Amino acid sequence: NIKSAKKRAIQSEKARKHNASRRSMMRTFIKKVYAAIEAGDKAAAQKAFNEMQPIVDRQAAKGLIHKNKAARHKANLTAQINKLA
Amino acid sequence: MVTIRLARHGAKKRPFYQVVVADSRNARNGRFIERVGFFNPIASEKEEGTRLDLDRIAHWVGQGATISDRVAALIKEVNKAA
Amino acid sequence: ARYLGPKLKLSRREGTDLFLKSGVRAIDTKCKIEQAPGQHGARKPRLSDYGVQLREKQKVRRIYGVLERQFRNYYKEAARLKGNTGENLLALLEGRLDNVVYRMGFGATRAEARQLVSHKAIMVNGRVVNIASYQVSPNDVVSIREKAKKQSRVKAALELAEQREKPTWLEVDAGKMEGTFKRKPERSDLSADINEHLIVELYSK
Amino acid sequence: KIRTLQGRVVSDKMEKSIVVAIERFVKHPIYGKFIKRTTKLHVHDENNECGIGDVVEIRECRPLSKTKSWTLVRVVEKAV
RNA sequence: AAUUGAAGAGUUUGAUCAUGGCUCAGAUUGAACGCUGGCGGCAGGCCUAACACAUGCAAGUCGAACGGUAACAGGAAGAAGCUUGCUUCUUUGCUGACGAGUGGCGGACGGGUGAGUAAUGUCUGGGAAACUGCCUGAUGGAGGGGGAUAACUACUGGAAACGGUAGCUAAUACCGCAUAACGUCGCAAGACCAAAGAGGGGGACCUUCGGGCCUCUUGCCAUCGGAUGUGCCCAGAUGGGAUUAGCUAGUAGGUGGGGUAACGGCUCACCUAGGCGACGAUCCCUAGCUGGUCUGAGAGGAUGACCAGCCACACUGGAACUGAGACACGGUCCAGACUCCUACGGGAGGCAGCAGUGGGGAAUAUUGCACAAUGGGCGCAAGCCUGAUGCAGCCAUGCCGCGUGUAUGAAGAAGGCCUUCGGGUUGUAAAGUACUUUCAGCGGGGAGGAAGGGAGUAAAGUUAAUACCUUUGCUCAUUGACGUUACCCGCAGAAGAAGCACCGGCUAACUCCGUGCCAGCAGCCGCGGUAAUACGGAGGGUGCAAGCGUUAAUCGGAAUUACUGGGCGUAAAGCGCACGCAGGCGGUUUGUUAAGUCAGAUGUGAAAUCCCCGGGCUCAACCUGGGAACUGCAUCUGAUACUGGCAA
């Protein structure tokens, strides 16, 4: 507002919208797996886990979700799928 | 990050620095990891103008600490009484 | 700082000569010693304990030409030093540079020696020392500066100092105007009238 | 050997949990008399079947629920 | 070497001894006020309104990340009036550089304040279920593509703030794909995740002759480490009030799901009725905590100003984004109070950052110089920024040091005061005489804080390269705000430099005159109603001294909250008596435990400060080397006399 920090403000805004888009995509991919588990279709749950796994793994690499959270999601969903099957 | 620097602790117009191992983000006279040695710009004719133990300096340098300009100059000047 | 006033008044009040003059006279002739100062000078002869303690303290202070604050600092240092407090205090008082100059005899009085020291006529260990309260240590050579040497003041003070007490704790050349502080004066080396053990209690009150 | 504590259970019914009272005999800072204090703490234990007047061995462990960071190790004798 | 430590007095009575209060002698302060005031060194300087703020400054930096010519410091071409070959004027990014823009790092550091917080913080001692920009060790990769956008152009709304529409463009910006182990998910088979280039130099072989190619430096990506920082958990300690006794429903516990970097009612669904509290819960008042400081012989009491560590906050309330790290002092959004600008359509603001202003108050300073040194941010470096910091200005606010001259000097001068009117005192005091010039003032000389950085050479290192680059030596110009520096030297001249309180006892120091219970004094006892050592003045004297005194506050004296270390027949003080829960204490004999207790060892108890021995500022204050202390806490190993537990 008084120093050239308006550049930081603009960068923060654009990064905010970008990261929000990525987060929404990842959350959609994660939630469809839970929908499959609730439906009880083992094949659908496994198929939804497969293509979702690279998304979370790569978003962890990009510096948006972190390895521990990325692994937590995979571990929980794998446990649920194994129990269902 | 750990670094070796000076800390002015003398008096007005009579500086007396102390070489300390401290995190860079801390203040000049703030918290330091440990104290290595001292330095007196007013050397005079006394038998003690500058002293520091090289063992811990080498320990920290090989552990990943940096050296300020004045501290590096002092190290290479003292070497061993030469 | 200094007193800057009549000198015989101090001796009259204290009842004894404090060595505030050259020595040729001003001991009996123009003193009226033992008569106390002022209008009620003679018509008084009574004193309390606290009175005698204060009188002894002021006697020492007026002998050595010091003020209350500096004397209290000296007392604190003497108490801090391990040993006998009175002996430490007397040694500290005797170790003053101006007092040492007077003992060596380069000055007729403490005031004259202090004036020399302030006017930069005394050197210690081959260096100038302008401070009168400078503390002299054992094995120290005290001498007059090479330049401005052979002055009427010191010339007229040596022969007077030739024989008064002959101090034994320091050496005097009496030639090139040099001396030496080889040891620290022992109590014995210093009078006997002073009851230091009254000042010690005065500063305990 | 690991650091532990010893105290009496005197705990009420609870699912896999018990409160223990560690007794210590400390000296009064000012008056110098020796007096006894108490420090009740909650302990986790599965297969919990401890009584009221039981002496138990307690050990500090990972935070297990709030107000619970201790677990039992051994029980010496019983109440009755 | 570091334990050399302890004083009382006045006042109740005709007098005495007790008890018991009040007062004084000491030390200390971020002090204020009155009188006075020469110099220097070191330190300190809004304690009240977390009241409101005009103005200036306090966070920028990278062209060696990328598009670019808006400044303009060069050069070249071309057109030209020509100085007649030298100038000028439009293009032109080749160029030393660079406003604006994208991108990276930094803005979470430094600095300010003590509102809130009574334990969710702090101190001590431990722990496990975590992350960590920059800095470092090791082991491995660094292949090939894509689509946009700012800047920039053409229009348009605006008083401003600030925009909107339509086109073009680069990257270490962004996004797939190739690649996948020691990494993630799984018991396993298995599945899956990344990358950026840039700069210096130059042989051979090839170039759309804008470079490929070789080498060197630096940069990027993944895993395991190190170090540093941060997050979390446990025990003990850390104010007052019982004229506050009951308080708690996500409350206490469990199963499952969710969530965080990480454990966890952190959050949901369900199940149980639990949890805290007299060893003080809940409620109310006050308060940042500590190392430390003051005082005290000690134990204790008071306190947290400066310095250092931690915490909390940034006009008030709330929220989250970005980021490694904020729920962010000079960021964002919403709401509120207040203020300001306006062309009335609409906008802006946060000094508890450094100066400074208004206000409040007994009270607290310059709208200063420099990045020379130290330390931070960016950068390969040069270098830029830095109200951090180094200095300077104001204040006797404190501690320390020096000076305001020295020697002689009887006619004991004159005047003042007293005087039994003999004289005494002021008083060697003054005058006079003989000497010196510290410090002020004038004139000269001149350390240290300066190490580095730069330019040029020699050696070594690396390599296809005598290149370029790095390291190590050598040579040449240098870099100071302080600064009319510290310090030294020379001239002249006692010349420019002393005041404050008190004098009845406590308590050191007495006479006269004025007044007459009036005026007045007074810390306590108390003085003054015509002979006042107590009021006012004078003389004299005592104490301290560039200070002196008064007021405010803490400790001491006060053994006057008595743990060390007090009392209750009559001075205050035994409940009217009794029974009894909790609590406190408990005869004797042995065994056992080892909790209390005692012994040794280890770890720790930041630095500074206090103390002992030393060193440097001309001595001191001040600065500084080593030690001691840091009386504590935790763990381990032993002792078993006593207390406790168990058994007989």
Ligand SMILES: [Mg+2]
């Ligand atoms: Mg600026």
Ligand SMILES: [Mg+2]
């Ligand atoms: Mg630019």
Ligand SMILES: [Mg+2]
């Ligand atoms: Mg800070």
Ligand SMILES: [Mg+2]
């Ligand atoms: Mg990238």
Ligand SMILES: [Mg+2]
């Ligand atoms: Mg992949």
Ligand SMILES: [Mg+2]
């Ligand atoms: Mg759970």
Ligand SMILES: [Mg+2]
């Ligand atoms: Mg918890």
Ligand SMILES: [Mg+2]
């Ligand atoms: Mg006491």
Ligand SMILES: [Mg+2]
């Ligand atoms: Mg306190």
Ligand SMILES: [Mg+2]
């Ligand atoms: Mg984030």
Ligand SMILES: [Mg+2]
């Ligand atoms: Mg900020």
Ligand SMILES: [Mg+2]
């Ligand atoms: Mg501000």
Ligand SMILES: [Mg+2]
């Ligand atoms: Mg300010």
Ligand SMILES: [Mg+2]
């Ligand atoms: Mg006012």
Ligand SMILES: [Mg+2]
């Ligand atoms: Mg003084």
Ligand SMILES: [Mg+2]
């Ligand atoms: Mg120089």
